[PDB]
Write a protein that binds this ligand. Sequence first.
Ligand code: MG
Ligand code: MG
Ligand code: MG
Ligand code: MG
Lengths: 369, 369, 369, 369
Amino acid sequence: SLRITRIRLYKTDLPYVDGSYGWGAGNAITVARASVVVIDTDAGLQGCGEFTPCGENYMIAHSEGVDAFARLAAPQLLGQDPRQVARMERLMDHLVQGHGYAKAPFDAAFWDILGQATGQPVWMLLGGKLCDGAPMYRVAPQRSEAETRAELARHRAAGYRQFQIKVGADWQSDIDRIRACLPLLEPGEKAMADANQGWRVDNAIRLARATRDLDYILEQPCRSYEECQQVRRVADQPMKLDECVTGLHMAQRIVADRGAEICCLKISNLGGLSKARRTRDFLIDNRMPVVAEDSWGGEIASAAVAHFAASTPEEFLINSTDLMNYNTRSTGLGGPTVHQGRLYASDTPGLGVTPDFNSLGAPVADWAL
Amino acid sequence: SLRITRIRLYKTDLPYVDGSYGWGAGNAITVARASVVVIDTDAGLQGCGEFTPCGENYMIAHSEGVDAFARLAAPQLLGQDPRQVARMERLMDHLVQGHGYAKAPFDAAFWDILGQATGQPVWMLLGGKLCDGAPMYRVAPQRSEAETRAELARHRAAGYRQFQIKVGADWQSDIDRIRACLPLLEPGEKAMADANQGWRVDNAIRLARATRDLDYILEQPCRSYEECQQVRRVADQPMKLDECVTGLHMAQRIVADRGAEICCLKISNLGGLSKARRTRDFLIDNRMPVVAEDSWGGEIASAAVAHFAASTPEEFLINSTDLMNYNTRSTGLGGPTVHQGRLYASDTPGLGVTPDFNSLGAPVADWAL
Amino acid sequence: SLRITRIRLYKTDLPYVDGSYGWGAGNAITVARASVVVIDTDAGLQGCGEFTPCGENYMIAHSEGVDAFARLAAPQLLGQDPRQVARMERLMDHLVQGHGYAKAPFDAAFWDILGQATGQPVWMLLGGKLCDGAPMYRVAPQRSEAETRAELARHRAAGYRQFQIKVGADWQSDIDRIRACLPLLEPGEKAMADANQGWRVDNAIRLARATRDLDYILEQPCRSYEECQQVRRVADQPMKLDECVTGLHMAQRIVADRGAEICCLKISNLGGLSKARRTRDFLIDNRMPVVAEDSWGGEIASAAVAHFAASTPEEFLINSTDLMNYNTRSTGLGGPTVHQGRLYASDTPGLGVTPDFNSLGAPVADWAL
Amino acid sequence: SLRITRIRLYKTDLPYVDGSYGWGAGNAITVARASVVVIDTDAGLQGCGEFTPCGENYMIAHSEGVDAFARLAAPQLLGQDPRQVARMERLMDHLVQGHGYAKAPFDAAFWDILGQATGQPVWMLLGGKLCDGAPMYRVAPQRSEAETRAELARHRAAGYRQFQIKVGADWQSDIDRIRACLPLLEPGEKAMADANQGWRVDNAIRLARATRDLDYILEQPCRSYEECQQVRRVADQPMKLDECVTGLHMAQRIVADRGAEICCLKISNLGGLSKARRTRDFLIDNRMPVVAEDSWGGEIASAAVAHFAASTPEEFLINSTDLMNYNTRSTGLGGPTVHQGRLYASDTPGLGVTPDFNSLGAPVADWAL
Ligand SMILES: [Mg+2]
Ligand SMILES: [Mg+2]
Ligand SMILES: [Mg+2]
Ligand SMILES: [Mg+2]
């Protein structure tokens, strides 16, 4: 028998590593606001979760929305059994409809507590270690042709075989970016051109027609699924859908249409690790390749990502990412590690992460039974 | 770290409690043939699982198929970590395609071992106790109409408030059998008419038109999904689909069509608890009412059923049944308990059931290292 | 009048002529396990049939399943009239649902008995000799450039005009294999790239795109039909479906969608010569090109293949294969022949084959009336 | 080895046993014009076939069309092997397109020859005796309440349990016919209202709505399939489709829509026994109830019908009919028999009928090798 005796909410800043990070149609990242949920039990077990967006207009999700949900839910979540992850899921969904991003860090703490109570890592409770090290990608580059060929060779020797070309702000120069990058990677390598919902549908098509002879992954060219499918009418490139993959309902529709070659799964865009796990399991059973990820964050959100990716079948997992190494600051102590281009989950009980209390500060809100 | 060190296959007879069990187009269960899989490990943890068909021609499943599969798979499973349920699932699926019924006892034994290794019941590893005592039904087999009135008094006495009327042997007398049964039930009580694929489409339509002024659940009127949809065109009765619900592919088709009011989920028909869980979770998310069951069997089969039912949201769980109480003989020691017409899962680690070695006899096959 | 008086089951090892057979996503048939069914009658007419899998995970079928089926069904088949193939078909399908592969050798033995009782070869009862010598293909060859050009020349000289490029284990080098083999063929000639369910959907699309300028038959690129259709969205190459063609239900779907250019018909994957003939005749009437085959096997299986091929209209028959020539051991005495790259059925009554009792050994099971 | 040496065409009058035969929207058949084909071989095996329309405007078929087909095709069939029924089918279809009704007597004669060459009845060559005595219907009656009771009592005692009401000339009084006939038959019995393509779609709907509380079979209410489907939008009655079922293509459409509860199969409307068998087997595999019959005719047409019925699975065979007993004159010697309201095929080799050369008179056309 277990009871939740306390809920606290922490908030901190996570500056970008380079200082400047561009995405989509001219968006700006410099500081990302983190929300850390800490849940305490009468047996002295404590779990932590995290939601951090990559921009406040990236998905149907913003940083102040975690506080507002917690204020309604946390008094109603006190005295309840936290290792019963699905029971907590249904209770949080009975308290407020939608708002999945805000429930996400609570759910990760519940999975963390389940892991500690069972003496097992989170990947074990998600089915086992189906992937020994998730493959990763490098977000490189932007620079000169001679510098690009050098930096790709530094990524190649480090073990990276997959590269993201960040596009979506100017379809015409994006054509030039794609055309110049692809002869610079060698035979076995993957390039994904992510527009981050950035192109208008006509301009997306012009780019597809101009790069029709080329082998790359066309990733989220437009905002809606319907615009993306309209681009797909012309585009033969393996299409990766990301921001529009908001849950099981959209996954069902992507499957019904065979509407993408890769589905990108962001844990908090799917509304928590419980819902993210169910969407991937559905997509895997329908033999759809997936990426296992979250929007942004430090060690705590990255620990959930690592366990999500390790529990994905190796045959169908395209990549994952090391979200904690995109920041100069931290949210938790521990989390996942990176070894030779691959992302590895912890094998210790729970999420393998505890809150970095000194980085976060005193809690901004607090509910004790 | 854990390894499978021994696999034993057991076979035993399970005689029916009321002599004959009339189901379908003229079939009968007097003695059902149980198949029990016992898995040993190097840490001394033992898991067990059971498949028992309710008739050898009922679904795409028969008792001798378990032996056949076990001969092919069991040497390949020795030395493997049975706690990693999804890894075993994919291993078994890599070794043979389909034949899910035969993989089902092995899958139940893994969830048993993982349960013991975590110190938790199977319902906790399936999400939590989302239902505290599954509302039960009792099947009233194909007998005379004067002696099913007394059987519905006998089953109501045992605390059941839901009754499955076995029909499907003759549409004409089945109309009479339905019309006589319905005014013999009190407020709050439900009836389902299960034809067990027995009716021809034209006859099923005739039955549906003749009983249009009545409230009962029309269950699997014909063999195929398509046939049942042809009936549904005319039949306004809530339709339960059962035998044709073979997996997630069918679940997807049923949801796309909104093709039933109830989907029955038999563990062995879905290919084990791992796959059953996922079809359950998919249907609940699409707000399809479910029944959590298996085909037939003793305490071991019933243990997996009870944990499956307990982790199903009570809002969407129509019923389950106590399979172990249909037989005069046992497969297991322990298992689930029933109290006032509700089925309760065990709260002890693992499945909460061990093999009844004295009832089972010497194993028919034994693989060790 | 005729009655089955004895059913015997034989099992034997069929080793591959060239050691190992590399198919699909990295699989190997070093030794195949043959299942031979032998049926005796009260007029002393004997029938025989064979199911042998090309890998135990190739389709929904394994070698131990025949044994399992026979144990349940054979006591019920004694005393029954084997000439009446549809009655026997019916009976089997009443005893078990699905498991068509296991029913397949029984069905072939019945067609064998009907042929002997009517004094006609099996092709005659299948409709007549609609093809005089079925075209064949060679697997060809994974070698040098000169050694390939020379080995294709000797197969060409021997009468072969069609070649199978075995692919499916590595999309990237599979591109190279297709690109290197096509300029080595001359122009009346046909290449089929069989991935054997090997590719992930995205990689199959990459391959199809990189070889869009090339004329070849793209064969079963992915596991499921839906995945193959997703590849077909992009690939203009004639598509051959094979392992997903499991029955009439699927053929209807394929025809409705116009979803392939060639349908590959494996006798045992269709559930026997009775269901294979009906699926064949359905596709032919809808003007779909067909291949007439089976999974694997000796002379007994090949005899069923040859008569199946001989009764396929020449205009729509793509090829067949000499399965008996892939092994170093025999299941049968007699069987079909190969002349100038073409497969010829026997013209003597029945299947044209008797069991090689010296090779088969002691029967593993024997039921007598 | 066998060769067609001689083809003869005969023509004869078959007067209706009860004067005039009222069907559809104002049609009457008093004398039907039979076309009998007689095929001789070099081994002295003779085969016969028959097509007789029930009215020249009944289906896409008339009596004079057999002559026309024969004059074009018969010189091209001399020297051919008649036992190879699919080779003959495909030769005919190569010589002319469509006109299957005219090919139908030739097809029957080839099945006759094959049965003689193999020493087996045609039902054996169509799979076996899957129905022992096909159930029959009586087209009765059409008169007063006192006279209908006496007529249904003699039919009941004679074994009949199924009754056709000939309607379709006046929807308004067809409502009254249905309404007055249905309560004059007991629990087990059945009744089909055959409008024989006769109602206009709005009138068919008015009839459907007026009788929406009644248990009968709505048979071919309108001419086209689409008109029938429009009626079916409103009509919950089991729908029987007949004249519009012209072949496999239409049977595929019917299956896809699940657009009927019974399909009526007329051998000559399907283009002969070969296509008729393939269409039936397809519908039975899709679990559609069928009627096995033909348009009209004497002992030769009825022999083919009885063999067609006998090889239809009894679970799915609704009824058949004794065509020879509707006429006062003969086309053949032998044919099927009737006992206790069931139609029985012959067990002797071939069709079980020879041409009644004395009734047929001089051959109208004669082709010799
Ligand atoms: Mg992205
Ligand atoms: Mg049921
Ligand atoms: Mg193939
Ligand atoms: Mg009719």
